[PDB]
Design a protein around this ligand. Sequence first.
Ligand SMILES: O=P(O)(O)Cc1ccccc1
Length: 232
Amino acid sequence: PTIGMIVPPAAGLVPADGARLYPDLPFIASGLGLGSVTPEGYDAVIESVVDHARRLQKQGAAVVSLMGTSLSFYRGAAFNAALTVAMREATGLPCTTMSTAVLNGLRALGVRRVALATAYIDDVNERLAAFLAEESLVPTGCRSLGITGVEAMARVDTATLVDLCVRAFEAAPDSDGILLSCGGLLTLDAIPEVERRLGVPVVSSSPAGFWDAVRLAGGGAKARPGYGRLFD
Ligand SMILES: O=P(O)(O)Cc1ccccc1
């Protein structure tokens, strides 16, 4: 089934991980035009999420994921659930969000104490921690990049991402796993290196978004190897 994705950047591309994780699967995307990875930024596009879900339905999507973590967590857990209900009601399609994806990924891996490694400024990190706590997880510490650029996220390199995850875990080595948050990051080469070095799993925004959306679509598709314990 064709999977539709609402993505933060204006360009509206399918996030790059899809072709690596699931080369055989069809994805389509619609771009919100988010201007900054900040609460003020989210407020300027959040009301258009329902319309973009409908656009994707009109293009033949059979499920829709809102592929933005902070866009979906910044107002707390209830709003993540409510926005999902709104999308479903507007389209009659199964819908999900990237915040739901990462929650599901951490749960699937049995992660309760979670170290945070993020691209964000601290206001956004505080909101992430509050969301996770509402959902019965225990954030243990946090290291972050403090980036507000949207398209800028794709340019953070692998070595930077590995170092970020390692530093986050170093701060709390009793953690069960690591949440690497920001769906604009290109994390697929970082994940196996971090898991190799540390011995704990990483749940990363974009790959968890794909994993969750493919689960939602129901076909039982398996990801290509080398992308983390989440993919078996
Ligand atoms: O995962 P988040 O918090 O929505 C940030 C993001 C998502 C996609 C592209 C750029 C930035």
